[PDB]
Amino acid sequence: SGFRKMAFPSGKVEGCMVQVTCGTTTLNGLWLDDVVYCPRHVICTSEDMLNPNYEDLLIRKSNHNFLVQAGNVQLRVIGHSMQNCVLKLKVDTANPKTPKYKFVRIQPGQTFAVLACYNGSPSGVYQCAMRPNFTIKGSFLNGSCGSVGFNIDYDCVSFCYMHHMELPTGVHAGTDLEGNFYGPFVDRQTAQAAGTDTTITVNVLAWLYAAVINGDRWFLNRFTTTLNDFNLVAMKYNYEPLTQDHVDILGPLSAQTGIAVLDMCASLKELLQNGMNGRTILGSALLEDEFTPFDVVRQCSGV
Amino acid sequence: SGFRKMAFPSGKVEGCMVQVTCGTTTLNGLWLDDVVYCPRHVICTSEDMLNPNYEDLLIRKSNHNFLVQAGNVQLRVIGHSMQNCVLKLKVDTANPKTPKYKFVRIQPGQTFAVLACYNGSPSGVYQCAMRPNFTIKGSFLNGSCGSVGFNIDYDCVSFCYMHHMELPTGVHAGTDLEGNFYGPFVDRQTAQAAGTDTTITVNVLAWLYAAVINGDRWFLNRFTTTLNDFNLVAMKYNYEPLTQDHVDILGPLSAQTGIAVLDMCASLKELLQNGMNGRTILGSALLEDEFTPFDVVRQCSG
Ligand SMILES: *[C@@](O)(CO)[C@H](C[C@@H]1CCNC1=O)NC(=O)[C@H](CC(C)C)NC(=O)c1cc2c(OC)cccc2[nH]1
Ligand SMILES: *[C@@](O)(CO)[C@H](C[C@@H]1CCNC1=O)NC(=O)[C@H](CC(C)C)NC(=O)c1cc2c(OC)cccc2[nH]1
Numbered sequence: 001s002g003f004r005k006m007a008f009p010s011g012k013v014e015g016c017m018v019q020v021t022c023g024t025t026t027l028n029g030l031w032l033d034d035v036v037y038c039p040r041h042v043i044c045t046s047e048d049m050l051n052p053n054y055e056d057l058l059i060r061k062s063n064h065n066f067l068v069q070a071g072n073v074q075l076r077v078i079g080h081s082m083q084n085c086v087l088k089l090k091v092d093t094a095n096p097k098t099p100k101y102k103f104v105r106i107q108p109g110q111t112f113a114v115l116a117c118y119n120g121s122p123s124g125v126y127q128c129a130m131r132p133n134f135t136i137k138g139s140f141l142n143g144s145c146g147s148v149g150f151n152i153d154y155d156c157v158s159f160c161y162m163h164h165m166e167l168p169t170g171v172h173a174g175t176d177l178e179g180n181f182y183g184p185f186v187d188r189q190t191a192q193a194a195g196t197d198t199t200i201t202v203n204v205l206a207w208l209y210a211a212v213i214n215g216d217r218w219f220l221n222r223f224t225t226t227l228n229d230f231n232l233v234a235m236k237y238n239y240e241p242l243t244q245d246h247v248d249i250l251g252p253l254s255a256q257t258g259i260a261v262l263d264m265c266a267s268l269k270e271l272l273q274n275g276m277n278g279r280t281i282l283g284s285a286l287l288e289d290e291f292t293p294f295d296v297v298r299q300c301s302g303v
Numbered sequence: 304s305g306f307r308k309m310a311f312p313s314g315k316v317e318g319c320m321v322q323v324t325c326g327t328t329t330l331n332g333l334w335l336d337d338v339v340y341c342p343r344h345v346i347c348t349s350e351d352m353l354n355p356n357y358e359d360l361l362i363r364k365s366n367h368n369f370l371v372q373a374g375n376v377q378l379r380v381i382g383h384s385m386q387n388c389v390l391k392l393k394v395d396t397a398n399p400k401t402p403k404y405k406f407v408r409i410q411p412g413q414t415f416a417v418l419a420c421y422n423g424s425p426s427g428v429y430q431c432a433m434r435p436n437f438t439i440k441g442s443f444l445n446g447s448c449g450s451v452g453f454n455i456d457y458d459c460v461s462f463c464y465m466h467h468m469e470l471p472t473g474v475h476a477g478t479d480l481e482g483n484f485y486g487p488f489v490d491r492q493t494a495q496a497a498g499t500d501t502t503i504t505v506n507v508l509a510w511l512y513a514a515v516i517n518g519d520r521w522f523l524n525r526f527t528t529t530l531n532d533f534n535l536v537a538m539k540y541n542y543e544p545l546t547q548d549h550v551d552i553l554g555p556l557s558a559q560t561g562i563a564v565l566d567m568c569a570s571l572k573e574l575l576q577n578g579m580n581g582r583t584i585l586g587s588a589l590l591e592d593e594f595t596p597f598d599v600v601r602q603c604s605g
Contacts, residue, residue: 006427139602140304
């Protein structure tokens with residue numbers, strides 16, 4: 001038993017992390033087969049980042065302008081190209097530790113593991129959720145760009161995020177591995193705001209089921225609600241709407257606890273209107289929304 | 304910026320997890336050099352775990368009774384021994400993925416990464432804090448014994464925890480890599496209770512230093528205190544007493560912010576006696592006690 005935010009093992013990703021340097025600008029790259037993926041703004045200087053014409057700055061660069069370091073060995077760049085905001089550097093050596101992998105664009109509300117790296121060296125790993133406003137609440141410092149987010153299904157690593165930016169509010173923004181940003185952000189040195197953040201309702205419900213499976217039932221109530229009436233209250237409290245697909249996705253958790261999804265909605269409705277009154281749920285004083293139904297099932301099945 | 308419960312990358316430990324099976328009992332082992340370490344109760348039968356005499360049980364075991372597998376490849380056992388609650392199985396193959404490592408016994412309050420493992424296959428990694436009552440609030444299922452907790456300094460892996468037991472309350476207990484249980488538990492199929500838990504004072508102070516570093520410093524007062532006066536006060540609010548080592552590992556943060564440790568102790572004392580008065584610290588009205596002074600520096604420095 002027990003329930004904590006838990007990331008997939010990062011070993012298969014650590015073996016792909018490299019360092020990319022152009023001028024006095026350094027960040028992390030991802031080395032899969034004979035191509036290294038990194039944020040394209042590595043080709044910028046301090047002055048270029050204010051408003052960079054990347055296509056312009058890229059044609060003016062030569063292969064030998066890119067220093068790529070895999071641990072202690074230097075990889076030779078034998079070609080370069082740009083796909084959206086991601087620079088792709090072909091190299092003379094294929095990474096022998098390349099795992100079975102795929103590039104996936106994650107949906108808002110879904111979770112992934114983040115391997116924070118600095119100077120091409122892994123530093124830490126933690127779970128994040130792609131929030132509705134397409135930011136993530138991570139822990140990134142200077143030099144963390146190029147760090148990637150991922151999940152692992154059996155032995156296949158699905159890469160879904162590469163880090164680029166920290167917003168003024170302290171949250172973080174990035175691209176998928178095709179170089180497309182999540183959210184309306186742009187890779188220029190400007191202060192950018194995200195859209196209004198909402199709470200991932202299906203995740204809050206799943207996390208409440210995790211509390212019941214771990215013995216916490218104090219928030220339950222005898223009342224029930226309709227899907228529409230719950231959504232009215234949810235939208236009022238800046239919660240994402242709950243769809244029938246979400247109700248279907250919550251089925252297994254409902255069958256294990258014997259609590260109908262719409263019964264848990266009434267319990268969440270009361271929590272939103274009455275509050276927790278100082279009480280805690282699974283140790284938290286706030287309603288947690290960064291656990292997916294999958295995340296919960298994978299720690300609370302059999303308990 | 305940003306504060307997360309962050310775990311060390313698990314790759315150096317993933318390459319060391321194996322599966323150990325005796326009869327039908329399977330759990331996880333740690334393969335370092337030519338030795339596999341694992342919980343000794345792997346030699347017990349289902350009905351035998353009520354009050355095992357591990358010394359007699361081991362007498363009835365030979366090298367050929369132990370099935371050690373890295374993946375599906377069997378590692379031949381060429382010797383066996385018992386050290387406290389851990390079994391050391393000498394194997395014929397030295398693990399080529401063995402990292403530079405050491406065995407450490409952590410103190411209550413310190414944090415470490417836990418690599419959840421099942422049938423020798425890593426499944427997840429998360430960060431834990433060793434409670435003052437020698438328990439960790441983790442996520443462990445059937446088959447998780449033998450999973451290890453660890454820290455990584457540069458390229459050295461410091462192993463500090465091997466999982467053994469889930470308590471009736473849902474928290475977990477285990478040993479260091481020398482087989483010595485953290486806390487007053489024993490490897491036996493019985494419901495054992497942990498001592499009443501307390502708040503990790505040293506970590507709360509680290510958290511306050513973190514708030515100061517970020518410009519959130521309303522709680523700094525004009526008082527100071529002796530270490531003894533603070534301890535006696537802290538024990539009345541279910542807070543751990545501080546040691547000399549606790550004062551010492553707050554040194555870097557005290558020097559970074561210019562706030563003497565005992566001045567911050569006096570600030571904490573005020574918060575304990577008078578509450579927060581609706582105010583928040585780093586966006587929360589609850590004082591957090593699962594980040595060590597090192598975790599704070601790592602996430603404010605780099
Ligand atoms: C990468 O490491 C750059 O290689 C870096 C990521 C962080 C720095 C601190 N915390 C992080 O996660 N990314 C940046 O510095 C990006 C650069 C590219 C061009 C987008 N810039 C920002 O993240 C950024 C710029 C500004 C800003 O301007 C002026 C004003 C306010 C916030 C801000 N963030
Ligand atoms: C290991 O996997 C055993 O190999 C297993 C750990 C977990 C199982 C589920 N969640 C875990 O963390 N360990 C045990 O089952 C141990 C075996 C001991 C070391 C011999 N037993 C317990 O942890 C345990 C026993 C009892 C009990 O008795 C009866 C009564 C109440 C709780 C309890 N926990």
